[PDB]
């Protein structure tokens, strides 16, 4: 626990705005959320404000809507919670098994006690007849982010799996750098286990609600072939 880290309260709200494009199609999202940052739980309500109804799966967007809301055991310091009031940024690459590619950048700030999220997304090389652009996915399976500290940043990697409507999994590798806007006490390497659910949506996905539970843990031990 660091001095000033109690600016992240037991209950916190956020506002989010995304500007994005998928295979050259521009869109925008606006939303709001809330959660229990020390319990690792949160919800959000998102609305499509431009480019709707989206001609692609919501599951591409859902992991882009909140790093203050991760539970930690007592001996893993919270990189993101310590970054306040200044906050942090992140830079992500998603590489899908069929060659779809997504670059995402994000800014997190704090204004009058509310967390402010600005997201920029560019997706390219999605097969037009693939499960993303045909809207044939059915949410994210629970996954694990392996995080390690380097040069005052955190580097994360996720083996991500989207459920397919017709059965089976559609995989991605998701690599992200997380960058505090000031120096903070760094954790060791550790894992974040996560389950993100779409709890409700209107028929055309112009209004979407999501929930996530995120928990930090140690690894038990890595660079093995099998
Ligand atoms: Na998160
Ligand atoms: Na879901």
Author numbering: 2 to 66, 71 to 226, 228 to 232
Task: Show passages lifted from the paper.
Genetically encoded red fluorescent proteins with a large Stokes shift (LSSRFPs) can be efficiently excited by blue or cyan light while emitting red fluorescence, thus characterized by more than a 100 nm difference between excitation and emission maxima. The large Stokes shift in RFPs is induced by deprotonation of the chromophore in the excited state supported by a hydrogen bond network formed between tyrosine hydroxyl of the chromophore and side chains of the Glu or Asp amino acids located in the close vicinity. In this study, we employed rational design and random mutagenesis to convert conventional bright RFP mScarlet into LSSRFP, called LSSmScarlet, characterized by excitation/emission maxima at 470/598 nm. After eight rounds of directed molecular evolution, we selected a final variant mScarlet/T74I/Y84H/K122E/W144L/S147D/F178V/K179R mutant, named LSSmScarlet, characterized by the highest molecular brightness at a 488 nm excitation and the absence of red fluorescence at a 561 nm excitation.
To understand the molecular mechanism of a large Stokes shift in LSSmScarlet and the impact of mutations introduced during directed molecular evolution, we determined its crystal structure using X-ray diffraction at 1.4 Å resolution. The chromophore also forms four direct hydrogen bonds (H-bonds) to R71, R96, D147 and E216, and several water-mediated H-bonds to Q65, Q110, T112, E145 and L200. The phenolic hydroxyl group of the chromophore forms two hydrogen bonds with the carboxyl group of D147 and with the buried water molecule. The negative charge of the pair D147/phenolic hydroxyl group of the chromophore is maintained by R198 that is stacked with the phenolic group of the chromophore as well as hydrogen-bonded to D147 via the solvent molecule. The structure revealed that the phenolic hydroxyl group of the chromophore is engaged in direct contact with the carboxyl group of D147 with the donor-acceptor distance of 2.56 Å. Upon excitation of the protonated chromophore in LSSmScarlet, excited-state proton transfer (ESPT) occurs, wherein the phenolic group of the neutral protonated chromophore serves as a donor of a proton to a negatively charged D147 side chain, and the formed anionic chromophore fluoresces. The relative positions of imidazolinone and phenolic rings in the LSSmScarlet and mScarlet chromophores are different. Two rings of the chromophore are almost perfectly in the plane in mScarlet, but phenolic ring is out of the plane in LSSmScarlet with corresponding twist and tilt angles of about 5 and 20° (according to Figure 6 in).
